[PDB]
């Protein structure tokens with residue numbers, strides 16, 4: 191199975207901090223397939239579904255014994271410190287074993303990283319957000335190129351994403 195019309199976007203170099211305060215870099219992800227999304231922690235009124243979907247994705251990949259990493263980038267890094275990241279994650283039955291939630295950057299940095307790497311327009315919350323616009327899941331290959339995007343908000347094609355993770359792993 192060969193991966194379709196790959197997006198081939200180049201993820202910019204980065205070093206951010208995870209929920210345990212540990213450095214995570216693009217370089218550190220070299221040779222690994224991974225999945226990426228964009229989240230914020232501060233929502234009383236309806237929280238977006240992305241982390242819930244990603245949680246069920248994480249479970250499905252664990253069940254097929256698939257080597258993958260998961261990265262969630264914060265889009266409100268001023269509020270989302272490593273402790274807030276932990277407390278958010280606590281609302282979900284997810285494992286940190288192959289998932290990092292990242293912060294340690296300004297709003298400007300992440301906005302520009304997201305536009306260059308993923309062609310995504312991210313923004314701060316207005317204290318709330320159902321979802322404003324799409325939000326997508328991205329598949330990144332072992333050499334740091336974005337290969338595919340998927341809808342993380344509704345009707346996530348879990349089986350397609352799993353099949354693409356397996357194919358992106360090939361020949362290594």
Ligand SMILES: [Ca+2]
Pocket residue numbers: 202203204205215216217218
């Ligand atoms: Ca790097």
Ligand SMILES: [Ca+2]
Pocket residue numbers: 204205206294
């Ligand atoms: Ca940095």
Ligand SMILES: [Ca+2]
Pocket residue numbers: 205206207293294295
């Ligand atoms: Ca940093």
Ligand SMILES: [Ca+2]
Pocket residue numbers: 217
């Ligand atoms: Ca190096």
Ligand SMILES: [Ca+2]
Pocket residue numbers: 242243246
């Ligand atoms: Ca669920």
Ligand SMILES: [Ca+2]
Pocket residue numbers: 222257258259
């Ligand atoms: Ca791995």
Ligand SMILES: [Ca+2]
Pocket residue numbers: 232266268269314315
């Ligand atoms: Ca905020």
Ligand SMILES: [Ca+2]
Pocket residue numbers: 243345346
């Ligand atoms: Ca669903």
